[PDB]
DNA sequence: CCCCCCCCCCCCCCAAAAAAAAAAACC
């Protein structure tokens, strides 16, 4: 008797709201297509289980922090260079200006179709992932450096001159602007910021970001990169062994990790995963520092093993292919 | 919470205002009540709603273009009398259709206190009548400069903390560790505004990634 | 029977927003 009078209240509210805002306005959550999480490979084997998903969610901010040379900028180029290779459409704001374009191309970006801008302001930086954002033609957005992002009264002032929370205003202004033109276009942004220390603070980490709190409330995966040692060929340091944790998480599970080496004029080393995830899957036997392949001896030490895997493509597919099947907690489709 | 009335829950990042929201639509649900979410943040997952116990199938869902449209939601549900649960995720998200016409540096003084100020007006009568509950999530900021008590503000000016009747400051205080997997957050709520009961009282408990909050470890601490 | 003529005066505000950054040996 009520429960009918109810659904026909419900059902004639449901009709205003679609007639007075448009067609998908409100409706079912269940049915809802528009609201599932799709995701793209980080260009890491080890980082795309530690984000549970399988990769960086679309429609979503993403924010990159760390100390100086930890591999921020590598890391989000290896990501456009995946996302081009799967026909998207890439922007690098370079607010830092210190982009090398040869060095893209060595980690296998397509430079003649990555767009990018060196904007003046921070205003500037902001109104064009505005504009990429609402065109629905741009798949990826990096904006490198939060820090480097300066407002135009501070441009057009002195040094020394006082902006009191300036930058964390024009942060907070564009996030609000920003959270729902990336969904409804499903482009992904991803903000790189450095550290700074906080002084007078409790007994906290004194490691803080740049632009103020708005980016770690809108952020659907935060993640520390840090610099944990150096690989050598003998003597010659030719890369950097990387940790990389999941700091935030709203896809799936946080405060996981990643180990990985970034290889200097190469990027980050794909089979060097493959082995470390081949071992701990029990796919690869490594009798002390023997690395053994169903009873073959792939070779001795990591670099050999890594070297076996490149000139036998057939058997590093086999052990992707499971080690994928495996490992993977939350896949999509 | 009291049904008719208007509820604020608040804290930093990451400390399971979104979480500790779906549990309670989940136990509504599980009553019988119709409820809805206006996402304003564009960051629900449908799949981890599922997980806490929420019927996804029957919860109304809306992710509005401006803030202006996310409150006309809010009102057309409350007059409906259909609608038990309203939730509101991130009264930070909600930007006035000025500022989204607008460009990135403009000054909007005022304009989103404004919004907050007309809406509260406008919705408090409708939601009594309709006995209908609205939980608005909000972020937190800081107050820069000469500061008169605590630097921490919430966002969308003063007229949120009068019309509330409930106002529910969350917290991480910790991790729950099975070994060294983290497989969940330790969780403090202090009731800062309280009008149906007295104020100031707190609860710990345990959120558990992917279950919700752990019943049976408040049930142990209880007993 | 016959024919119209002319204007007068204002009234009330509404609402906050945001961090930034190390410095230094001592025997
Ligand atoms: N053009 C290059 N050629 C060779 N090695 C490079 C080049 N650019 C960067 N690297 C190295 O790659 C590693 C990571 O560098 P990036 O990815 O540029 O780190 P980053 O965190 O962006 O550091 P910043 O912006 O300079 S604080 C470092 O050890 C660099 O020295
Ligand atoms: N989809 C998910 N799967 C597993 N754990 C999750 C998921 N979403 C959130 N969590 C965790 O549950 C805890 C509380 O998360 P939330 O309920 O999203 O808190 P919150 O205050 O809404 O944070 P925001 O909106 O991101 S500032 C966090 O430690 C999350 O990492
Ligand atoms: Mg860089
Ligand atoms: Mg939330």
Redesign the pocket.
């Known amino acids: 008797a009520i429960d009918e009078n109810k659904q026909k209240a419900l059902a004639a509210a449901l009709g205003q709201i679609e007639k007075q805002f448009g067609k998908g306005s409100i409706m079912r959550l269940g049915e809802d297509r528009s609201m599932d999480v799709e995701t793209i490979s980080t260009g890491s084997l080890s980082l795309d289980i530690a984000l549970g998903a399988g990769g960086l969610p679309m429609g979503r901010i993403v924010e990159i922090y760390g100390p100086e040379s930890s591999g921020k900028t590598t890391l989000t180029l290896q990501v456009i260079a995946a996302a081009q290779r799967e026909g998207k459409t890439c922007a690098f704001i370079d607010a830092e200006h210190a982009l090398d374009p040869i060095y893209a191309r060595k980690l296998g970006v397509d430079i003649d179709n990555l767009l990018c801008s060196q904007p003046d302001t921070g205003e500037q930086a902001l109104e064009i992932c505005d504009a990429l954002a609402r065109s629905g033609a741009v798949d990826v957005i990096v904006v490198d450096s939060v820090?480097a992002l300066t407002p135009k009264a501070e441009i057009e002032g002195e040094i020394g001159d006082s902006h009191?929370?300036?930058?964390?205003?024009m942060?907070?202004?564009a996030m609000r602007k920003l959270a729902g033109n990336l969904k409804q276009s499903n482009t992904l942004l991803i903000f790189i910021n450095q550290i700074?220390?906080?002084?007078?603070v409790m007994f906290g980490n004194?490691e803080?970001?740049?632009?103020?709190?708005?980016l770690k409330f809108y952020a659907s995966v935060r993640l520390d990169i840090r610099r944990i040692g150096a690989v050598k060929e003998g003597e010659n340091v030719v890369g950097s062994e990387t940790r990389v944790k999941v700091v935030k998480n709203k896809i799936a599970a946080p405060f996981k990790q990643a180990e990985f080496q970034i290889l200097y004029g190469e990027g980050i080393n794909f089979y060097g995963e493959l082995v470390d995830l081949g071992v701990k899957e029990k796919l690869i036997e490594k009798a002390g520092a023997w690395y053994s392949y169903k009873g073959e001896k792939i070779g001795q030490g990591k670099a050999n093993a890594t070297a076996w895997l490149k000139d036998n493509p057939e058997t590093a597919k086999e052990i992707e292919k499971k080690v994928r099947e495996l490992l993977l907690s939350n896949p999509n489709s």
Do not use: D, E, V
């Open positions: 820090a009191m929370g300036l930058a964390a205003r942060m907070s202004q700074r220390m906080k002084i007078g004194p803080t970001t740049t632009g103020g709190n708005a």
